[PDB]
Design an enzyme around this catalytic site. Structure first.
Site, PDB file in Angstrom:
ATOM      1  N   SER A 167       0.856  -1.210   0.000  1.00 19.75           N
ATOM      2  CA  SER A 167       0.000   0.000   0.000  1.00 19.75           C
ATOM      3  C   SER A 167       0.891   1.261   0.000  1.00 19.75           C
ATOM      4  O   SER A 167       1.643   1.417  -0.970  1.00 19.75           O
ATOM      5  CB  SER A 167      -0.952  -0.128   1.151  1.00 19.75           C
ATOM      6  OG  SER A 167      -2.036   0.774   0.988  1.00 19.75           O
ATOM      7  N   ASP A 202     -10.663  -3.410  -4.665  1.00 18.55           N
ATOM      8  CA  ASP A 202      -9.664  -2.485  -4.071  1.00 18.55           C
ATOM      9  C   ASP A 202      -9.745  -1.168  -4.848  1.00 18.55           C
ATOM     10  O   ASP A 202      -9.564  -1.207  -6.085  1.00 18.55           O
ATOM     11  CB  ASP A 202      -8.262  -3.127  -4.083  1.00 18.55           C
ATOM     12  CG  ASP A 202      -7.178  -2.353  -3.331  1.00 18.55           C
ATOM     13  OD1 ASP A 202      -7.416  -1.169  -2.999  1.00 18.55           O
ATOM     14  OD2 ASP A 202      -6.095  -2.920  -3.103  1.00 18.55           O
ATOM     15  N   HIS A 235      -8.313  -4.928  -0.141  1.00 19.08           N
ATOM     16  CA  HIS A 235      -7.036  -4.318   0.283  1.00 19.08           C
ATOM     17  C   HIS A 235      -6.513  -4.998   1.557  1.00 19.08           C
ATOM     18  O   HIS A 235      -7.341  -5.477   2.354  1.00 19.08           O
ATOM     19  CB  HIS A 235      -7.241  -2.814   0.512  1.00 19.08           C
ATOM     20  CG  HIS A 235      -5.955  -2.074   0.501  1.00 19.08           C
ATOM     21  ND1 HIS A 235      -5.143  -2.044  -0.620  1.00 19.08           N
ATOM     22  CD2 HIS A 235      -5.313  -1.396   1.479  1.00 19.08           C
ATOM     23  CE1 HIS A 235      -4.064  -1.335  -0.341  1.00 19.08           C
ATOM     24  NE2 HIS A 235      -4.143  -0.927   0.949  1.00 19.08           N
TER      25      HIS A 235
END
Ligand SMILES: [Cl-]
Lengths: 315, 315
Positions: free
Chosen positions: B158, B255, B285
């Site tokens: 991320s 996501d 995610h």
């Protein structure tokens, strides 16, 4: 010509297959020759012992079955039943040679490769009946060919992925040789030509909407047959798909069959089947088989994922 | 209400985080606690040698830097510099414990894990300069800690993936310690909230559009700073991206960040960088970090692919 982002080898394979006449516009015997000539191009093949055995399918005739074994293995290996693709019309032990050698060596398995009867000379459901019959005779070879039929994976590419998942359907319905798991490389799942991927990648990505319509036309022109779940497994109900073997379903981004592969994965998952579904970016149909695409990042990653996933299953 | 097909553990984690107030509506301290608590839930962790060192980044202060080592290893191992995610606001060695131990063991590598200063207390560009500072010091710990800096992988999840790829741009710009390759798990690549995946998955999939707006607001509210390629690497030109290290970019279907991850892979491939881009179906995610998602088919396939990809690099 306008295309999305592709790996160099995928772009080159798409451009090489754009001119008319395309493979599906040749007399079927010239098409078969062209794929052979494509699969003579340079590649490094793993090392294997090869045995070609005539196998009798009964009502569905006598076909060659190729048995592939890694060198110097004394022990009883797991077995992979591999069903080749190329539109029900083309393909043979030579076209899929690099792929099945790679699977044999990196999973340390015997690969059993049915040379099922090709369309249009053979129509549905000959190929699936012949493949299902060979699956039932695997126990008959397990001892001479030193493999364990209780460690059984079915796998196929494209049309072969179709017939591979259909093997799991026929086995559940007829109580045949238990299949532990299934690996489908970019399978055909539906006789429908109207998915968003069919529309987006219709032309310029080697496999065409028009060519897929032709492949289905060679296999069977009967709507009733195409609607059977053993032709179009995407049409299977939840109850049809319940308790099928664990599946790995691999798709490519720039493939007309992408959406029907990903849709089939969701239907298995909704039926509580174990599903690993992965899409590789910037890659076209046929990427684990075509010699010139052997070096693509998609091909290297697809083979690492698939061999590991099978290795984990066998132990 | 209703979601696309998801793995059971992704659906459950989505529902658990549906009600208000969400983690990004809490004061930042309760936010950090909530995530630490989530990562107390039970999971199998591989065994490792752990060691917390203080490292001095000069201008940007002293931070804890965790070294992870697989037990009983008498050789110089390859090294992975791992930058954790969780929005620049949350995360620490505890929240990412399961993942960094799995990476260390399966790659047989030391994992160096910078506990960079979190936002909003720290702002851009503190975290990237601290992470960059530790990189240039790796050659100095290489002997006590027995690793070879010439087998260096940067990786991150991320905003960790954001800062990982940004490490490669800073390295290129500054002539820093050469990075062999980069692994980005569902990276942030762009301060834009208007991609198709941002719209489709805006709500109900744990990570929300409103959540990402807030995370970016904690990092920096400056539009000038957000336009910088060291904040939004998707904004890099072909010339900026040329010669960056080989990249593995993993995305999940469900996501908001999916499209900007996939778009950054295309830009790298168009700049002739070696790119392996793979999207996992039916996953949300944070799937390689969150303990409750550890057994998903997505998590198992992403760990198998990314660990084998790194091993093949270290030859
Ligand atoms: Cl035509």
């Amino acid at each position: 010509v306008e295309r999305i982002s592709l790996e160099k080898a995928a772009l080159e394979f798409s451009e090489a297959n754009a001119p008319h006449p395309r493979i599906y516009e040749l007399p079927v015997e010239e098409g078969r020759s062209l794929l052979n000539e494509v699969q003579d191009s340079p590649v490094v093949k793993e090392d294997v012992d090869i045995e070609d055995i005539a196998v009798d399918t009964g009502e569905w005739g006598e076909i060659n079955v190729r048995f592939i074994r890694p060198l110097h293995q004394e022990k009883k290996l797991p077995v992979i039943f591999y069903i080749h693709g190329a539109g029900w019309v083309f393909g043979n032990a030579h076209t899929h040679d690099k792929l099945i050698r790679e699977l044999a060596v990196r999973t340390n398995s015997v690969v059993v490769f049915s040379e099922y009867s090709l369309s249009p000379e053979a129509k549905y459901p000959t190929a699936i009946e012949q493949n299902y019959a060979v699956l039932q005779q695997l126990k008959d070879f397990a001892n001479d060919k030193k493999f364990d039929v209780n460690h059984l994976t079915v796998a196929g590419d494209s049309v072969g992925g179709n017939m591979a998942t259909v093997m799991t359907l026929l086995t559940k319905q007829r109580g045949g040789q238990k299949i532990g798991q299934q690996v489908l490389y970019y399978p055909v799942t539906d006789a429908n030509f109207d998915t968003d991927s069919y529309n987006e990648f219709a032309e310029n990505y080697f496999l065409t909407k028009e060519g897929m319509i032709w492949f289905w036309d060679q296999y069977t022109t009967s709507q009733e047959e195409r609607h059977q779940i053993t032709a179009s497994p995407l049409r299977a109900t939840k109850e049809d798909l319940a308790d099928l073997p664990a599946a790995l379903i691999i798709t490519g981004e720039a493939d007309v069959l992408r959406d029907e592969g990903e849709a089939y994965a969701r239907k298995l998952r909704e039926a509580d089947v174990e599903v690993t579904q992965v899409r590789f970016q910037a890659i076209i149909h046929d990427f684990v088989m075509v010699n010139s695409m052997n070096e693509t990042h998609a091909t290297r990653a697809a083979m690492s994922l698939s061999t590991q996933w099978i290795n984990e299953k066998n132990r």
